Ligand binder design. Structure first.
Ligand SMILES: C[C@H](N)C(=O)N[C@H](CCC(=O)N[C@@H](CCC[C@@H](N)C(=O)O)C(=O)O)C(=O)O
Ligand SMILES: [Zn+2]
Ligand SMILES: [Zn+2]
Ligand SMILES: [Zn+2]
Ligand SMILES: [Zn+2]
Length: 509
């Protein structure tokens, strides 16, 4: 009675998705779509709490051996059942060296038995600690107790894929070929323009799905996206131009949202070669970024300075104060000069750097401003390069850029999601930071069984990141979005921004 006749949605995503295969996805452009096409053992509600997915229950006596009960009537988009074996197959495939998954390490973070040996080729994938006891009963064996293990199963990397589909060949993820178990099915795609999905009528909870079509529109120039939103072509954006914020608040109050998100923006230094291999160069660079200037003037949509890597909002985290947070920029800038001269740069040998970022107005403005801070305080010159998301994600692992722009949004709500990114066994370690003390302190944290004791080690880890500056944290994210008043059910207050079109609906407008 309150619902519109046409239950169709146009959703903006910032970039063209790199891959719709859960085991080859790495960032939010893909991931946003994958959550409509596939479904894990569990989902997240709007508060970020764990709720039933394929599983209706999950039990553990010791937080090490976990048993999931699956629903009888979970289905793939081809009407076949979703089974425990599907998961066995999909998680072996995640760790299988043949897959080259950029999330293989996630199975090791979970502590699933034998994950690291399999990733390293020392054990076969059937040695993984995951068993189908029957079609509806999946039993997982972890190395260590992990109270939040179930949370990890809401993460895309643990979504099931269908073997027969996967084994039909390299076009399996094309429109009309891709068979997943989520609320929607891929109907149409044109590269760089649109992805269109309609409901999987076999999805167990299809009775509740409202939206009959959702079109995702990738547009990496935030101005062009907001322009289409104001014109009425887009019902919800991802981000918006920072310089339009006050005018947006003014013209469309109620549609502008900027809650705190579990993610951090940062620059990665090459710790392995070039000038950035010297700890003093890195520290000078990081100290010279004026974080309150950035968040106040260049951003101003509620972002906070990142003095530590892990976001303040992260459940279980009580940071110790940083000594940079308490200094003035003047002090910071002068120490930075001292450090760089000790490194041996100045008029006698000026510092030249390359920086990669992925195409975006925001990243371009932040790069210009960082480069200005460095020019001005340290006499550094930076050659900028921009590349679209899908190309950036490979160029950055090439060892070729002194500075690389990036973010990390948490795969679950606990500090290890952040701090493990800098361990030597983590594929997403862009700086190639390889510090045995650092690795060992996080391995210890994972054996601890109180929040306080874990937090002491996570603090020790953050200290090493301050001392060695392999990366420069810049800011803590907000989930900046424009949402039309008639779009309901978007989980705008989920700190991880985990959303499924199946919760959304359109009111008469
Ligand atoms: C998903 C994984 N944990 C991860 O963080 N991957 C990151 C990439 C994660 C990723 O897509 N960030 C987005 C986050 C944007 C947040 C959004 N509110 C905004 O304000 O724009 C980005 O940079 O635009 C990696 O591979 O580099
Ligand atoms: Zn049965
Ligand atoms: Zn069918
Ligand atoms: Zn803090
Ligand atoms: Zn409309």
């Amino acid at each position: 009675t309150v619902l519109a006749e046409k239950q169709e949605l146009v959703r903006h995503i910032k970039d063209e998705p790199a891959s719709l295969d859960p085991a080859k996805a790495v960032g939010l452009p893909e991931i946003q779509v994958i959550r409509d096409l596939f479904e894990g053992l569990v989902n997240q509600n709007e508060k970020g709490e764990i709720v039933p997915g394929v599983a209706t229950q999950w039990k553990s006596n010791d937080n090490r051996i976990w048993t999931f009960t699956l629903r009888d009537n979970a289905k793939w988009a081809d009407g076949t059942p979703v089974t425990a074996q599907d998961f066995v197959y999909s998680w072996q495939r995640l760790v299988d060296p043949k897959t080259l998954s950029p999330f293989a390490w996630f199975a090791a973070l979970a502590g699933i038995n034998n994950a690291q040996a399999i990733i390293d080729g020392k054990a076969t994938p059937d040695q993984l600690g995951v068993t189908a006891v029957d079609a509806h009963t999946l039993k997982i064996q972890l190395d260590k107790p992990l109270p939040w293990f179930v949370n990890l199963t809401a993460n895309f990397a643990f979504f099931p894929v269908q073997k027969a589909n996967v084994e039909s060949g390299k076009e399996w993820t094309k429109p009309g070929n891709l068979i997943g178990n989520g609320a929607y099915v891929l109907k149409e795609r044109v590269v760089n323009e649109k992805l269109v999905v309609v409901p999987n009528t076999h999805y167990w909870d299809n009775a509740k799905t409202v939206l009959q079509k959702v079109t995702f529109l990738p547009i990496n120039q935030e101005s062009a996206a907001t322009k289409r939103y104001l014109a009425g072509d887009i019902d919800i954006t991802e981000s918006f131009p920072k310089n339009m914020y006050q005018k947006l608040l003014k013209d469309i109050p109620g549609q502008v949202y900027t809650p705190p998100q579990l993610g951090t923006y940062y620059y990665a230094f090459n710790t392995q070669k070039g000038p950035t291999a010297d700890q003093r160069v890195r520290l000078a660079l990081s100290m010279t970024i004026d974080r309150r200037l950035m968040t106040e003037k260049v951003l101003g949509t509620g972002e906070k300075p990142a003095w530590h890597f892990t976001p303040d909002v992260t459940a279980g985290f009580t940071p110790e104060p940083s000594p940079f947070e308490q200094m003035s920029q003047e002090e910071l800038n002068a120490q930075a000069k001292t450090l760089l001269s000790a490194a041996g740069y100045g008029p006698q040998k000026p510092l030249k750097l390359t920086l990669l970022y992925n195409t975006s107005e925001n990243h371009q403005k932040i790069a210009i401003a960082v480069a200005s801070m460095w020019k001005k305080n340290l006499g550094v010159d930076v050659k900028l390069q921009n590349q679209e998301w899908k190309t950036y994600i490979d160029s950055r692992n090439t060892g070729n850029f002194d500075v690389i722009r990036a973010s990390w949004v948490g795969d679950y709500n606990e500090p290890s999601t952040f701090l493990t990114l800098l361990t030597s066994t983590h594929s997403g370690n862009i700086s190639r930071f390889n510090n045995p003390a650092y690795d060992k302190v996080l391995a210890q944290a994972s054996t601890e069984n109180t929040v306080k004791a874990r937090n002491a080690d996570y603090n020790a880890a953050e200290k090493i990141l301050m001392e060695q500056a392999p990366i420069a944290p810049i800011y803590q994210y907000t989930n900046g979005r424009l949402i039309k008043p008639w779009l309901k059910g978007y989980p705008i207050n989920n700190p991880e921004d985990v959303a499924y079109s199946r919760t959304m609906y359109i009111v008469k407008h």
